[PDB]
Design a protein around this ligand. Structure first.
Ligand code: HEM
Ligand SMILES: CNCc1cccc(-c2cc(C)cc(N)n2)c1
Ligand SMILES: C[C@H](O)[C@H](O)[C@H]1CNc2nc(N)[nH]c(=O)c2N1
Ligand SMILES: [Zn+2]
Length: 410
């Protein structure tokens, strides 16, 4: 009941007991392993105080006042407000703790060494899609910090009944538009073409280029969402050059500095925050491997390998592999020559192993998803390839949620 994870590059072993505190199910049974399925699958007051009890107990058991009366009066206070209103509200300190631990428990995140250094923006007083748009601009500006990126989350009012829900309809706050062409093909980002249509549907005026920043579709208190365009001076973008190849400029590629996921749900003490955009900084491979070279994304390996003049008749020339390394040299180089925060997959996996140690020491475990932790290129020349990870679901936590245009009573 006190399981062991081994590292095979180092022969180092650690003991996981943190998984005893786990609660939610994983998809795996004693006779089936779902570790590579992407997404496996009102809340009453009878269930809401147990979750409120569990959260608050570890929150006072973090500030070395577990079991005190300051704890007990807080437990009694939440208990009775869960009688009165049936729901409850978190303290400022309980929200900052809960948010930082949702990140800390996010087993699919390799950059979690930074989990404590997070800036929480309490937007629970927000009421309008314009108020949402204000909070979100202030997040963008702060989290960007002139390229010296800082991580942050903005927490909008929690779900109450179920109809009245704050939702950022964008998947990330900043993404490039996606238009399918009359000739069947696709301009911009193909992942967003469904979204982009809903944007033009709500009256967006598309510039119809490659790297068009989408507007925000912000839904406030269950209301029909409204389009707002982040001021372009707030959207920091990096033009992508290669430090050897001058033809690389003519590829005319760029990316935005700020990775800010907006479509997930923040669970704290049984409360559900449907709108909780959180931002850090990019690991190089997300842009240079996935965004740029996924077949159903920008799919640029074709053209990069051309300009390198590569043996493209043969699958086995590793022409694909060769153009993939140059592209991530170009992402990295470009972001750093502009002083915009980016981390390479070597230094990020190293930090994660480093983070993983401290978690097994001063916490007794680190939930971790190998399928997601291993970078999508050069897997085994990074140290996380050789690290056995235990995946389990701790709380507070970030969760996926449905897209709102497929659930909203419109
Ligand atoms: C310090 C900078 C950060 C780095 C370098 C980093 C790194 C990464 C990477 C590479 C991924 C994989 C993304 C993908 O493959 O689609 C990821 C996912 C994730 N990150 Fe981190 N991240 C950072 C900050 C944050 C913050 C600030 C939060 C939350 C407050 C967070 C929570 C998550 C979660 C929940 C996921 C998984 C979401 C999903 O399953 O799609 N990360 N991160
Ligand atoms: C399923 N995609 C989730 C997703 C998509 C795109 C980017 C991220 C991300 C988020 C943060 C905070 C940091 C980082 N380096 N990347 C996450
Ligand atoms: C089918 C498979 O689970 C899927 O491709 C996963 C694999 N690992 C991943 N890992 C990361 N970091 N990001 C991803 O999108 C995925 N996709
Ligand atoms: Zn499994």
């Amino acid at each position: 009941r006190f399981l062991k994870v081994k590292n095979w590059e180092t022969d180092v072993v650690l003991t996981d007991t943190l998984h005893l505190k786990s609660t939610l199910e994983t998809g795996c049974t004693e006779h089936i392993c779902m570790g590579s399925i992407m997404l496996p699958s009102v809340a009453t007051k009878d269930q809401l105080f147990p979750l409120a009890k569990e959260f608050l107990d570890q929150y006072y058991s973090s500030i070395k006042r577990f079991g005190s009366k300051a704890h007990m009066d807080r437990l009694e206070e939440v208990n009775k407000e869960i009688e009165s209103t049936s729901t409850y509200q978190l303290k400022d300190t309980e929200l900052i703790y809960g948010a930082k631990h949702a990140w800390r428990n996010a087993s699919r995140c390799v950059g979690r060494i930074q989990w404590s250094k997070l800036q929480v923006f309490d937007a629970r007083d927000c009421t309008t899609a314009h108020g949402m748009f204000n909070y979100i601009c202030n997040h963008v500006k702060y989290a960007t910090n002139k390229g010296n990126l800082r991580s942050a989350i903005t927490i909008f009012p929690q779900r109450t009944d179920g109809k009245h829900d704050f939702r950022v309809w964008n998947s990330q706050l900043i993404r490039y538009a996606g238009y399918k062409q009359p000739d069947g093909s696709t301009l911009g980002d193909p992942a967003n073409v469904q979204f982009t249509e809903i944007c033009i549907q709500q009256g967006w005026k598309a510039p119809r280029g490659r790297f068009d920043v989408l507007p925000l579709l912000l839904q406030a208190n269950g209301n029909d969402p409204e389009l707002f365009q982040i001021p372009p001076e707030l959207v920091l973008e990096v033009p992508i050059r290669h430090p050897k190849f001058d033809w690389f400029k003519d590829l005319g590629l760029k990316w935005y500095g700020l990775p800010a996921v907006s479509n997930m749900l923040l669970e704290i003490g049984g409360l559900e925050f449907s709108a909780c955009p959180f931002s850090g900084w990019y690991m190089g491979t997300e842009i240079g491997v996935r965004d740029y070279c996924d077949n159903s994304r920008y799919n640029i390996l074709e053209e990069v390998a051309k300009k390198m003049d590569l043996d493209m008749r043969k699958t086995s020339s590793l022409w694909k592999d060769q153009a993939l390394v140059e592209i991530n040299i170009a992402v990295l180089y470009s972001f750093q020559s502009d002083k915009v925060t980016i981390v390479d997959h070597h230094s990020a996996t190293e930090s994660f192993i480093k983070h993983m140690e401290n978690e097994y020491r001063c916490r007794g475990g680190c939930p971790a998803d190998w399928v997601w932790i291993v970078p999508p290129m050069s897997g085994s020349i990074t140290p996380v390839f050789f690290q056995e990870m235990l995946n389990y679901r701790l709380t507070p936590s970030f969760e996926y949620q449905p897209d709102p245009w497929n659930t909203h009573v419109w």
